[PDB]
């Protein structure tokens, strides 16, 4: 699944990995 | 005496091309004279040789295309420390992050104006060109999905359109970094190597010299579900070797394989289902997995740690990465029994 915008990915799913490393 | 080394992973060998490594304090003039002597002595025996590149900066020596028949002769050359046959490697703000990977889409919205494309290119011929690098550049410094948003990046192309590079190409790329730094010094350097080939004496020595010279190196542990010590640059001690973990605190499974483990792994980082810049369009995003993605998170964490504490030694930066990592969350049962004690149960984290 390739998404053409950030918002489209956000609607599809704050990524887990950036949360996990404590960036949020 | 001088020794000969070739990749133990026979399909990864690149016969006909040799890295001839000279003793630690060999001058450039001497390296050129030893190359000429090899060409001249080889010519007397009716062999044609080509000097493809002469090394100076980290490691003295030269890259020669020639018949393996000339190795005994080449090993008797004065100043020669060892010779290694070439082999393949594969894709797995006051701080400058260098990326040695595939070509990159520099105008992607995510990394536009944060990545500088160098003129460096050393790739083997082929047997989407920019997918692997763009995603990784995005994981390090992307506006929406990036770890170190304020980090600037310089990229070198060492991986071809298939994610295939050479140990020789990688050495030349690592030498290019050292040279650029001596010509125009800046602040702390972070060198991201999201690639891996079989254990390499020359590649580990180049990484060790770059590390002893104060430059921070971050590498992929490898996606061979094996011991990271049998792969390079993963096995180079002073390098930061990163394994991949998933959201469920599980070491990553990549088909029949998965993340590498063992004593050569320094720590783990998120490396499964990683959203980042897709080189398919300027605003495109895609999810990817691998130790390359995991290493990219660590290069971003290290870039931010070095930006906050620019005087950190390589050893102090290592202690900070361990100290701030999440402890004992990884499922050890996924690793081979004897590897559980040897593999550090660490998941990279930014300081709070
Ligand atoms: Ca290490
Ligand atoms: Ca332990």
Domain ranges of chain B: 3-86, 92-347
Residue B351 structure tokens: 């300081």
What's the distance, CA B151 to chain centroid?
19
CA of B241 to the centre of ligand 1 (A): 6
Q: How many CB atoms lie within 10 A of CB B285?
A: 29
Q: Does domain B92-347 have CATH number 3.40.50.200?
A: yes
Interchain contact, A2 vs B286, CB within 8 Å: yes
Q: How many CB atoms lie within 10 A of CB B140?
A: 31
Q: Which residue of chain B has the CA closest to A16?
A: B247
Pairing of strands B80-91, B3-5: parallel
CA of B289 to the centre of ligand 1 (A): 22
Residues of B forming the active site = 101, 132, 292
Pairing of strands B189-193, B96-101: parallel
Specify the CATH superfamily of domain B3-86: Peptidase S8 propeptide/proteinase inhibitor I9 (3.30.70.80)
Q: What is the dihedral of CA B114, B219, B291, B159, to 10 degrees?
A: 70
- C-alpha span between B169 and B17 (Å, rounded): 12
Within this chain, domains B3-86 and B92-347 share the same CATH topology? no
- C-alpha span between B118 and B174 (Å, rounded): 13
Q: How many CB atoms lie within 10 A of CB B100?
A: 28
Give the experimental resolution in Å: 2.4
Question: What crossing angle do the helices spanning B314-324 and B291-308 adopt, rounded to 10°?
Answer: 110
Q: Which residues pair with B206 in a beta bridge?
A: none
Contact B53, B101 (CB under 8 A): no
Q: Which residues of A touch B297 (CB under 8 A)?
A: 17, 21
């Amino acid at each position: 699944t390739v998404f053409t915008s950030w918002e489209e990915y956000l609607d599809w799913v704050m990524p887990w990995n950036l949360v996990r490393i404590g960036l949020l | 005496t001088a020794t000969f080394h070739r990749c133990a992973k026979d399909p990864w060998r690149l016969p006909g091309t040799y890295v001839v490594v000279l003793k630690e304090e060999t001058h450039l003039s001497q390296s050129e004279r030893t190359a000429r002597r090899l060409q001249a002595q080889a010519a007397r025996r009716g062999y044609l040789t080509k000097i493809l590149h002469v090394f100076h900066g980290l490691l003295p020596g030269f890259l020669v295309k020639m018949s393996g028949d000339l190795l005994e002769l080449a090993l008797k050359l004065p100043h020669v420390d060892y010779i290694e046959e070439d082999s393949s490697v594969f894709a797995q703000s006051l701080v400058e992050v260098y990326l040695l990977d595939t070509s990159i889409q520099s105008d992607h919205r995510e990394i536009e104006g944060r990545v500088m494309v160098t003129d460096f290119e050393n790739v083997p011929e082929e047997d989407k060109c920019d997918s692997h690098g763009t995603h990784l550049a995005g994981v390090v410094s992307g506006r929406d999905a990036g770890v170190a948003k304020g980090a600037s990046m310089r990229s070198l192309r060492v991986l071809n359109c298939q994610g295939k590079g050479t140990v020789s190409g990688t050495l030349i790329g690592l030498e290019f970094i050292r040279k650029s730094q001596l010509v125009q010094p800046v602040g702390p350097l972070v060198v991201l190597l999201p690639l891996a080939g079989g254990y390499s004496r020359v590649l580990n020595a180049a990484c060790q010299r770059l590390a002893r010279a104060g430059v921070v190196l971050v590498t992929a542990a490898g996606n061979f579900r094996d011991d990271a010590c049998l792969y390079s640059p993963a096995s180079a001690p002073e390098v930061i070797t990163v394994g991949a973990t998933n959201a469920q605190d599980q070491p990553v499974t990549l088909g029949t394989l998965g993340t590498n483990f063992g004593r050569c792994v320094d720590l783990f980082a998120p490396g499964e289902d990683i959203i980042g810049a897709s080189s398919d369009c300027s605003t495109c995003f895609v999810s990817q997995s691998g130790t390359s993605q995991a290493a990219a998170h660590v290069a971003g964490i290290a870039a931010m740690m070095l930006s906050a504490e620019p005087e950190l030694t390589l050893a102090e930066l290592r202690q900070r990465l361990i100290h701030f990592s999440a402890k004992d969350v990884i499922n050890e049962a996924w690793f081979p029994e004897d590897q559980r004690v040897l593999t550090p149960n660490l998941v990279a984290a930014l300081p709070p």
